[PDB]
Amino acid sequence: QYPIINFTTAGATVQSYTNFIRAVRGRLTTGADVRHEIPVLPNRVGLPINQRFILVELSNHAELSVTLALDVTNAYVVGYRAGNSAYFFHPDNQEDAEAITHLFTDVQNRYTFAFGGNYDRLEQLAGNLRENIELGNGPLEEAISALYYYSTGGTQLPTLARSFIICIQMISEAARFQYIEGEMRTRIRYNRRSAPDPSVITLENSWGRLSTAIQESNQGAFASPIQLQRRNGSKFSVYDVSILIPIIALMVYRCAPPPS
C-alpha cells in the first residue's frame, strides 16, 4: 500500500504546514542521492510500481477530504480521489498509463481526463494564468471543496482547473522548492491570499532545466546561465549550483552523478 500523508487547512499554521511539506519530501525520496547539498528524486528507470506513488489526503474546515496521488519521480499530481470517484490526468506515455491502474483500485468509478495536468493546459481551462490565481490557506480550503464536488456536478471545469493549480503549487512546488515553501508559509502566517510573483513562477517554469543544469554542471558551474526573475520581474542569471542550495529542495533525476 502507498504511503499516506495527511494535511488539513482547518486551523492550519506555519508549523503544521511545515511538518506537512517535510513529510511529503521524506516520502518522495530516500535522500540517499544528494548533489551539492540538494536531494534528488528516485530515478524512474527500474523503479518498481510498488514504490511509484505517495498519497496526500487533504482535509478542510468544511469537513471534506480528497486524496491526491503524487508520482515520486517528479512530485507530479497524477490524479485524485473524492469519495467513490477518481480522476487522472491524461497520461503522457504507456508506462504512465499502466502505472495509474495501480492507484485507487478500491474506488467504484475511475476516469481519465482527456486533458493533461501541465500548467499550460490547466491555465487555458481555468481562464487564468498562475500570476492571477490567489494562493494561501483560504484558496486551498476552497480548492479541496471544489475537487470534492466535481463528480456530482457542483464544480465547473474552470474552477476545477484553478483548484488543481492551487494544490499543485502549495504541495508539489513547495516540496520541490524551499523558496516556494517559504512563500506559502508567509501566506499562511498572515492568512493573506495572493497570486505568486515572478520569482515563484520562473522557478516553477525552470525546475526541469535547473535540475539538469545542476546535474550536468562542471563541479557546480553551469555551461549555460539560467535566467530567473526577482519579485519585481527583473531578470538575473544563475551561473552556479551554489546560489540554488537554499532555494531548491528536490531535483528530478536526470543522470547518475559523475565520479566524486
Swiss-Prot record:
Positions that bind a carbohydrate: I4, I5, N6, G11, G46, N137, G138, P139, L140, E141, E142, N191, R192, R193
Effect the entry attributes to changing D71 to A/E/N: Suppresses the toxic activity
Entry annotation: catalytic residues: Y76, Y119, E173, R176
Main function: Acts as a glycosidase that removes a specific adenine residue from an exposed loop of the 28S rRNA (A4324 in mammals), leading to rRNA breakage. As this loop is involved in elongation factor binding, modified ribosomes are catalytically inactive and unable to support protein synthesis. Can inactivate a few thousand ribosomes per minute, faster than the cell can make new ones. Therefore a single molecule can kill an animal cell.
Coiled-coil region(s): none
Organism whose genome encodes this protein: Ricinus communis (Castor bean)
Catalytic activity line of the entry: Endohydrolysis of the N-glycosidic bond at one specific adenosine on the 28S rRNA
Glycosylation sites: N6, N232
Official protein name in the record: Ricin A chain
Applied uses, from the record: A deglycosylated form may be linked to monoclonal antibodies to produce immunotoxins exploited in cancer treatment. However, a point mutation should be introduced to eliminate vascular leak syndrome, a side effect resulting from endothelial damage.
Binding site residues for AMP: Y76, V77, G117, N118, Y119
